[PDB]
């Protein structure tokens, strides 16, 4: 029962380990262990429940333990001290093979093999802690211990890839406990958390690890918005060291989401549009990605209303995520028709939903767009239209008030109109024949460059597998 | 098979309260006898809410009579030697009864057995179609769709020309049933040319549908040839009321009567679009187009109009017309503005160079996004 | 005008008839729509082909 289960689960762990162990120590095959590690987290999360969970303790004992016996003890203590011959020496399956850590030599300290093993062991504890949902004591105990250990290491390109993943867990775990309960102690430790990412990012730029650079930047941009600091976020993005060389599309998609938010509040809805479209493209469409797609659609719709444009009606409809976007359709109806009352009623009703994501705050500003949008439409239908007509239609308070709103608009040039005070009408200036002017050329010049950039992307990537095969023997 | 549609169409008028109370109760007289006669309780249960237990004793009796009759008939004709064919015909006969009481569930079962057995190749095609007919009875669009594929699977293997004529009309009703009319107008007018009816909804229906769909899709010149100068539609004259209303609307548009045009729109809506179950859905959708069309032609012919000339021709007031016009203008099928101040309706109608430039660049953006999509994935892999 | 043998414009708001005998715009753009039309289907096909990697 217990003995069988502990050991069998442990067997699989060592097979996975051997593969990653062998590959890092024979040249730098850097990319290949990384693909294994992705698959590893998934396989491990599913494992843990089946075949007991003190399978990890056996593993600790079995190999060399420099601090990890104490860590594993601490976890065991937390959920009640468990006993079944779980005293050290319980497991020992090294047996003098150099691939399973030569038993005499390692212990004497005539050879060291602990380095990379320790980083991996830690990876299993953070994963398992998070799995189980052991918070409070352990969360602080864990951060306290892992950060000085990496900073005592001088981490290879390979070892850089491993610790990019502990970093993820360090950030999330501090957040969940904070969200669970507010306390000043949570607040003191928050300052500690920012400072550690900033010190490490410089180290990781010098090793130029595409994995490591990517993970850290996504976390930091997120932290900053949560504390609302505009200023720090703009400086942090200026550098743009955020790679696109090899990193996953999931990593990028996060990166693009944050930029959209950031640019939107700074009043650039032009560039926010491009980012938010770009964030959807990179993201895979998966169920495991559903949370991201759901937040992405919502942000897209807010940007289109901030610009002054109505997004496609069909977006909200044809979605199978249509239920969440119930608040979005009511906002879209109110904006397009210029109904002053409707708009205010909508945001009262869906307020608490909207407050969750702090889209409430954007919607206070979307009050302005109700009016802006409606005037653009009235002007496109009716070229010369007395100021008197406009007010009657959309119940605007007076001729003096609407004149001024229109006046403001055409400074920023959205309406593309002009007021003729003396004659009492507002006259749209549009006339077409912009094909004759130089503007299509500017447009088309860019479109050529985009195709060329496609070709290059094709060419470079294409040759990288072929190298492998020519070098490999073939039948 | 035949009555199942007859019932429901009557029942629809009873259901609606949009219909006049006089008409409602005409329908009530007619349907009530046939509920009892064809024993229609499973379907009738839905509608009764939705607008005797004897019907049921009758159901159950009928169920059992018809149910038992057919049962032991097959027990008889398993024995009597002809194992592929006579069991098949007897199994069909159970399904005939199921189809009679408007329970589609039980129909599918018995006709399933019929198919298993290997019989005349024509016969099978007839059965598949019968199942697709049941989709029109419930008027579930989703039921008709799935089934019509099985029919189309066997049609061309069968290479039946004869039941190939039926295919057209049924597929007319799917495309009619749906909003998309571009496929519907073509299909339904071809079936006026060739009609083959073996247990099929009247020829009258086909006339009504061609006329509507003709109007929505076709341009001016092709409307004349295919609808106005249809020999069948003219030869059948306007007999039935539904057919009559649409015919007056068609002539006026083409003869460029403007005064009676708007009253015929009101007429058509009262008497054509709303009685039909399939184009009840599309009543709103049809009208919006047709009001744009009278205008779209008129603006072609006139650089400027007054509001009073435009309004008055149709027989609507200036205030009403102006409002209707601002609804249609942002869809950009009219390409005109209304000068309030000068009181003129000026016509922009751009077919300039800059116009043709827009149409090709929107196609190019569609191709641009796809290239990125295939490439980026495949490069990572 | 609808038939189309003189295609011009009538002014209700005044009383002039303007005649335009201007036949038709660019073949160039038109045949360009056809080439783009083919290409949209073609890329999806290729992508179908390219799915042995997946």
């Amino acid at each position: 029962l217990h003995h069988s289960e502990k050991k069998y689960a442990e067997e699989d762990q060592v097979q996975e380990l051997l593969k990653v162990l062998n590959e890092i120590s024979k040249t730098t095959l850097t990319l290949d262990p990384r693909y294994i590690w992705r698959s590893l987290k998934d396989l491990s999360s599913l494992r843990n429940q089946e075949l007991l969970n003190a399978e990890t303790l056996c593993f600790t004992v079995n190999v060399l333990y420099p601090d990890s016996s104490s860590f594993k003890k601490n976890l065991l203590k937390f959920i009640t001290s468990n006993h079944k011959s779980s005293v050290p020496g319980s497991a020992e399956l090294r047996n003098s093979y150099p691939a399973s850590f030569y038993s005499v030599n390692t212990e004497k300290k005539t050879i060291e093999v602990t380095a990379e093993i320790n980083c991996f062991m830690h990876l299993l504890v953070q994963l398992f802690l998070w799995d189980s949902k052991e918070l409070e004591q352990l969360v602080e105990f864990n951060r306290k211990v892992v950060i000085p250990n990496l900073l005592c290491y001088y981490n290879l390109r390979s070892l850089n890839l491993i610790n990019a993943k502990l970093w993820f867990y360090i950030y999330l775990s501090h957040e969940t406990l904070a969200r669970s309960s507010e306390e000043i102690n949570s607040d003191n430790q928050n300052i500690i958390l920012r400072s550690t990412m900033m010190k490490f990012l410089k180290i990781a730029s010098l090793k130029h690890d595409n994995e490591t650079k990517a993970m850290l930047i996504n976390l930091i941009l997120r932290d900053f918005l949560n504390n609302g600091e505009v200023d720090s976020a703009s400086d942090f993005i200026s550098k743009l060291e955020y790679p696109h060389t090899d990193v996953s599309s999931s990593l990028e998609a996060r990166y693009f989401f944050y930029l959209s938010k950031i640019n939107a509040i700074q009043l650039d809805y032009s560039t926010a549009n491009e980012y938010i479209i770009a964030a959807i493209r990179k993201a895979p469409h998966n169920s495991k990605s559903l949370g991201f797609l759901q937040q992405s659609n919502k942000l897209h719709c807010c940007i289109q209303l901030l610009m002054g444009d109505i997004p496609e009606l069909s977006f909200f409809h044809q979605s199978n995520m249509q239920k969440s976007l119930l608040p979005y359709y009511h906002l879209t109806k109110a904006v397009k028709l210029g109904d002053l009352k409707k708009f205010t009623s909508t945001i009262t009703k869906y307020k608490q939903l909207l407050l969750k994501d702090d889209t409430y705050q954007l919607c206070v500003r979307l009050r302005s767009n109700v009016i802006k949008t409606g005037i653009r439409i009235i002007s496109l239908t009716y070229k010369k239209i007395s100021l008197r007509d406009i007010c009657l239609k959309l119940n605007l308070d007076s001729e003096q008030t609407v004149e001024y709103m229109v006046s403001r608009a055409i400074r920023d040039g959205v309406i593309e109109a002009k007021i003729n005070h003396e004659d009492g009408f507002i006259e749209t200036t549009e006339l077409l024949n912009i094909y004759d002017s130089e503007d299509p050329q500017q447009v088309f010049d860019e479109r050529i460059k985009f195709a060329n950039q496609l070709h290059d992307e094709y060419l470079v990537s294409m040759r990288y597998p072929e190298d492998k095969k020519t070098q490999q023997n073939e039948k | 098979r035949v009555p199942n549609y007859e019932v429901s169409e009557k029942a629809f008028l009873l259901t609606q309260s949009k219909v006049s109370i006089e008409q409602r109760k005409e329908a009530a007289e007619f349907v009530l006898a046939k509920i009892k006669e064809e024993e229609m309780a499973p379907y009738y249960k839905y509608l009764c809410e939705e607008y005797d237990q004897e019907l049921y004793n009758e159901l159950c009796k009928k169920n059992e009579s018809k149910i038992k009759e057919l049962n032991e008939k097959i027990q008889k004709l398993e024995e009597d030697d002809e194992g592929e064919l006579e069991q098949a015909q007897a199994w069909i006969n159970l399904g005939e009864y199921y189809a009679q009481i408007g329970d589609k569930d039980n129909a599918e079962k018995t006709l399933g057995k019929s198919l298993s057995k290997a019989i005349s190749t024509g016969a099978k095609i007839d059965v598949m179609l019968t199942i697709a007919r049941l989709g029109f009875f419930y008027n579930d669009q989703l039921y008709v769709k799935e089934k019509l594929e099985a029919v189309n699977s066997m049609i061309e293997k069968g290479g039946d020309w004869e039941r190939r004529n039926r295919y057209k009309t049924y597929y007319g009703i799917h495309c009619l049933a749906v909003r998309n009319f571009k496929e519907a107008a073509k299909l339904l007018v071809d079936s006026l040319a060739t009609f083959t009816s073996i247990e099929l909804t009247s020829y009258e229906s086909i006339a009504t549908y061609a006329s509507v769909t003709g109007l929505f899709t076709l341009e001016r010149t092709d409307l004349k040839s295919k609808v106005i100068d249809s020999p069948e539609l003219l030869s059948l004259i306007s007999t039935t009321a539904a057919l009559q209303s649409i015919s007056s609307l068609t002539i006026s548009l083409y003869a460029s009567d403007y005064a009676s045009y708007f009253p015929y729109l009101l007429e058509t809506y009262a008497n054509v679009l709303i009685p039909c179950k399939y184009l009840n859905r599309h009543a709103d959708f049809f009208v919006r187009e047709m009001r744009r069309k009278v205008y779209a032609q008129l603006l072609e012919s006139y650089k400027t109009l007054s509001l009073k000339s435009m309004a008055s021709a149709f027989g609507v007031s200036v205030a009403f017309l102006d409002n209707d016009l601002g609804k249609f203008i942002p869809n950009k099928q009219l390409n005109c503005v209304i000068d309030r101040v000068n009181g003129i309706v000026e016509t922009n109608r751009p077919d300039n160079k800059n116009a043709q430039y827009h149409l090709l660049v929107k196609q190019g953006d569609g191709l641009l996004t796809k290239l990125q999509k295939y490439g980026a994935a495949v490069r990572l892999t | 005008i609808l038939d189309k043998i003189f295609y011009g414009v009538l002014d209700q708001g005044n009383g002039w008839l303007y005649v335009y005998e201007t036949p038709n715009q660019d073949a160039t753009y038109d045949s360009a729509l056809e080439l783009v039309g083919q290409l949209n289907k073609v890329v999806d096909q290729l992508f179908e082909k390219a799915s042995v990697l997946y």
Partner: peptide, 27 residues
């Protein structure tokens, strides 16, 4: 051209793997 070359690489991976296993079995 991007896809076709990839297709070829994919088959060849299998060709080379199979060499290694078969050399082991034979020996």
């Amino acid at each position: 051209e991007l896809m076709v070359i990839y297709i070829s690489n994919l088959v060849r991976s299998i060709i080379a793997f199979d060499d290694l296993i078969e050399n082991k079995i034979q020996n």
